[PDB]
Amino acid sequence: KETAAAKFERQHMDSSTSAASSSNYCNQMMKSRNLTKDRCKPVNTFVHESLADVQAVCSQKNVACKNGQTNCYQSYSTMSITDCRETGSSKYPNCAYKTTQANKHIIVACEGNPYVPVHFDASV
Ligand SMILES: Nc1ncnc2c1ncn2[C@@H]1O[C@H](COP(=O)(O)O)[C@@H](O)[C@H]1O
Given a contact cutoff of 8 angstroms between Cβ atoms, the answer to whether 42 and 85 are in contact is: yes
CA-CA-CA-CA torsion sign (31, 32, 38, 42): negative
- Whether 71 lines ligand 1, by a CB cut-off of 6 Å, is yes
* Residue 85 is assigned to a ligand binding site: yes
Give CA–CA dist 122/113, Å, rounded: 23
What amino acid positions are annotated as catalytic residues? 12, 119
Q: What is the largest CA-CA distance in the chain?
A: 42
Total structural domains within the chain:
1
CA-CA-CA-CA torsion sign (9, 13, 14, 16): negative
Query: Ligand 1, residues 66, 74, 119, 123: which to mutate, most atoms within 8 A of Cβ?
Result: 119
How many A from CA of 19 to the centre of ligand 1? Answer: 25
Dump the DSSP string for 64-92: --TTS-S-EEE-SS-EEEEEEEE-SS-BT
Give CA–CA dist 79/76, Å, rounded: 9
CA-CA-CA-CA torsion sign (86, 47, 17, 8): negative
Structure's resolution in angstroms? 1.9
Parent domain of 121: 1-124
